[PDB]
Amino acid sequence: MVTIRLARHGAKKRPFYQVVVADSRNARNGRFIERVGFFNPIASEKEEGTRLDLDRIAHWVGQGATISDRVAALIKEVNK
Amino acid sequence: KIRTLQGRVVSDKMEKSIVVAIERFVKHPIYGKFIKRTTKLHVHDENNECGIGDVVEIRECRPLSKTKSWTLVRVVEKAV
Amino acid sequence: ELQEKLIAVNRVSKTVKGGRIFSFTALTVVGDGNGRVGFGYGKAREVPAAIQKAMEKARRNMINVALNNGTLQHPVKGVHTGSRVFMQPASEGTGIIAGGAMRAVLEVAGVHNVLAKAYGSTNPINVVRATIDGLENMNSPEMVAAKRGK
Amino acid sequence: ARYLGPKLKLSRREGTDLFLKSGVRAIDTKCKIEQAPGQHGARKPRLSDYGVQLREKQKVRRIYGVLERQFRNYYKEAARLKGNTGENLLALLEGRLDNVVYRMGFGATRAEARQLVSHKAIMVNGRVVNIASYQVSPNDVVSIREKAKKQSRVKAALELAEQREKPTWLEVDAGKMEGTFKRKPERSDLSADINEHLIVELYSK
Amino acid sequence: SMQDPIADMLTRIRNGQAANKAAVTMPSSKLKVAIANVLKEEGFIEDFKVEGDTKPELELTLKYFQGKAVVESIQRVSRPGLRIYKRKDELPKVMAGLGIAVVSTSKGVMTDRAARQAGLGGEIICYVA
Amino acid sequence: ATVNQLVRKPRARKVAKSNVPALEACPQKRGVCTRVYTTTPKKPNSALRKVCRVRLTNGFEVTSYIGGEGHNLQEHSVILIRGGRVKDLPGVRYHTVRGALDCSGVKDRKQARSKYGVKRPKA
RNA sequence: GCUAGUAGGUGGGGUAACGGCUCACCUAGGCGACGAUCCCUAGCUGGUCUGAGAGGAUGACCAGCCACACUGGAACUGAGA
RNA sequence: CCGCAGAAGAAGCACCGGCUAACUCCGUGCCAGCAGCCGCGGUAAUACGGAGGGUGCAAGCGUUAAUCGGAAUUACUGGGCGUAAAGCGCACGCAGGCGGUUUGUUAAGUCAGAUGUGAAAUCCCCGGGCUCAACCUGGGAACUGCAUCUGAUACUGGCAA
Secondary structure (H helix, E strand, C coil): CCEEECCCCCCCCCCCCCCEEECCCCCCCCCCCEECCCECCCCCCCCCCECCCHHHHHHHHHCCCEECHHHHHHHHCCCC | CCCCECCEEEECCCCCEEEEEEEEEEECCCCCCEEEEEEEEEEECCCCCCCCCCECEEEECCCCCCCCCEEEEECCCCCC | CCCEEECCCEECCCECCCCECCCEECEEEECCCCCCECCCECCCCCCCHHHHHHHHHHHCCCECCCCECCECCCCECCECCCCEEEEECCCCCCCCCCCCHHHCHHHHCCCCCCEEEEECCCCHHHHHHHCHHHHHCCCCHHHHHCCCCC | CCCCCCCCHHHHCCCCCCCCCCCCCCCCCCCCCCCCCCCCCCCCCCCCHHHHHHHHHHHHHCCCCCCHHHHHHHHHHHCCCCCCCCHHHHHHHCCEHHHHHHCCCCCCCCCHHHHHHHCCCEEECCEECCCCCCECCCCCCEEECHHHCCCHHHHHHHHCCCCCCCCCCCCCCCCCCEECCCCCCCHHHCCCCCCHHHHHHHCCC | CCCCHHHHHHHHHHHHHHHCCCEECCCCCHHHHHHHHHHHHHCCCCEEEEECCCCCEEEEECCCCCCCCCCCCCECCCECCECCCECCCCCCCCCCCCCCCEEECCCCEEEHHHHHHCCCCECECCECC | CCHHHHCCCCCCCCCCCCCCCCCCCCCCEEECCCEECCECCCCCCCCCECEEEEEEECECEEEEECCCCCCCCCCCCCEEECCCCCCCCCCEEEEEECCCCCCCCCCCCCCCCCCCCCCCCCC
8 A cells, every 4th residue: 555645845934745656654754655746836937846757656546556635636737 | 506616625623514614806986906705604514525625616505504605506616 | 498486495505513593495497388487496595586596597497398279188197206296287277286396386387277286295496397207208299199190 | 335436536547547527628738647646646656466467447437437346247258258358347347338329429427428318318229227237239239218318418428429439339429319220349440448358367366 | 835926026027126227037937938028028127038948037127217217116916815806997096197007907918007908907907106 | 023922012003191191081160269379471472361270079289271351250169171271381281161160251252152162142 | 713503414393484592412623904892982774964075974853764662671462572 | 116305225354563554643561461282561662452454254254163174193094113202121832813835625804796775965076956055856876885796817815645
């Protein structure tokens, strides 16, 4: 069981999430498996705030991954 | 490869245990050269099939008695 | 053929029979801006003609170096005295990088971009022994080239 | 501090002329240079190597207005561009926003230009800019504000600039006071500030 | 008993320039032949002849410049007592940008330069320049 | 010399010992005071030099320099140690910064105040 | 110099599993200057700092691992302590 | 971000004998005291104390402690050892280290490529996002390594002759 989730590592009064594959039995900013891109809500189209990896995840989900509200709906914001 | 070390016996005083002595060329990055660092190890043997000073082939493997995890595959020669 | 400089400057002494002299002797260098530049020891019992006379004996000396574009092509390894002398080639972004005697003698000879070092005694009177060890010890593009001429 | 101390007095203590707080009417007429800063400023000492390096450093340092701490930051940015870091170093000191604006004739002086950068007078694009340590980008849009050309300071600050060489790596404008940082400062665009040799000695320690 | 053969070569080269011979003697061996070859091509020694027919010696002919020697950088980077190998991209260039180091590799005996883009690195035996 | 000797007998680099020990390993020390003496100095440099021993509160009996002018020191006075030393006094490896803790600074100092603590006047 | 569950071989038992982990018997070895054992010191690492590099020192915050949870000790539960 | 008066509310600390940038004047007179080091001071103190002036840093500065550097100052890179510190008093010799030369072989060392693997962050290169920078950040490189796989045979080691 892996758990794909957000992880803010960005400086104060400026969220920079990081969609990561971890496990839920460890720290949000702590122990990770491997990334699956980023989520920046501060992008507004002067830079790209995302990195997809659609492919990678699609394998991981079958491998028993779990998606949190945000992460799941964030594939949805960009659809395919 | 079964992690094969061409070692040289140095102890038949037990039956099914023979201490084989092997070395790797260990380098110092601060003396900046290789040397011979010889390390005796405790191998698990079929019975005995060799004398001392017997060049052999040994291999890694399961543990199966205290400080064992190498086996004798064959006795190369008694003397070179 | 001129580009006045001084380097070191100090005093020396002989004991007269009980009185003492206190002669001011010293090192200088006068440039040419392309090398051929020397050294002199200008004794003078007084201070001004101590560099006067040095710059004289500079004209009575020279060590030719061949070098190009302010960067001596050949690293220095040379040792005379207990002064170890060094210069690692730096194509760009280095000035002289020096506080030695070997600051000044590696500028006047037309030398606007080198990077330098020394080990050994700090003793400036033979920090000038970088002149055997970087001026007269050199290796030039055409120098090696005439080995290959053969 | 930001300095902003007794300006010219340093020109005095180095004996070298600069427009910093001088006019084009006073050029050491009714002002004085080098007569004797202090009661010992008349007589000249020979100076040790470190002597030269310190004085000379301060020469370059005060015709941008730049601090110590600031200068180090510049030195690790210079040696973090691939180039001659003598050039890179003095390129970045003439990369200060306060300087390019002065060198496009919008500042009376180097210093007065930075008084502008204090207030909301300077801008790049539609974006307001108040920080002077900003290294402008190749091909910039470094304009004055609408409601800043109406001030009597900004009108009078194109005035004192007039009749200078204005070393070109950039455009000098008067329709919209909007230039372009259209190539970098270079060894040729130094105007006898070639003292890159000194400070790179000083700094490497 | 010898501990370095290779020194016997280099030692007598610098010595021999200094001595003002025009060719010096010391015992050959296979490798030694091939070291004297790169020197020779590049120009570091005049020419060479090997009398093995009786007992091997590398009679290597000394090149002079005019009176001044051509030795100034001669030293052995390696030793028997510090056998060394430097990879394809961790091989140092020696003394000067004009330097020349005899370097052995898996193919042949070569040089700093040659060995480099020859897809190889190996023992830098010595250097002359 | 030769490498193989070093492979057995590794080369040192330091011994890990200060010129001046600190005997508490920190910037500053609470020490008491044991005796306010004024000895004459080591080496001939003829003066009166105000010294005092001082039993530190973490142990160690050490001797500290007294500087400035005036005093307030007592046999059970408790001082703030500057640390560091001066020449010409032997068992002194330690120095007292006045004008810190209870102790008073220099009476009537108006330049180079930080050295030997004391506030700048209102003027 | 050190080491008797000490080192190994047989056969039982135990553990999630291999294993003196533990047990019965048998052998008398095993380990050590290529530094055991013992003593002092110390959380360990990525790394950090410094440094031209090599190296040294160092291991705060940030991350991983290990241990510890008033002190000492023990098991129970449970996939896991 | 907009407006509001009005320079308004916003500079200090250390040092200036030499190292080391930066001098004079008085007070004191080996006393007072200074002091990182070398050393000052016993009556025109460029070195003390105060002042005047100046120099460098600056909302921080200095002082201390502490690490590394400089220091090739314990030297793998990068040292000496005749007299300066520094060759056992001298032999033999086990272990260890080193190994003349020729052919053949092996490919362990080694070199190359291949494949895993070297977490991320930190670091580094280019390039974005915060008014800029600090910081944050994207991709890539580094990740000095290690092992295995497959190749190479000059040297190194092993064996044979």
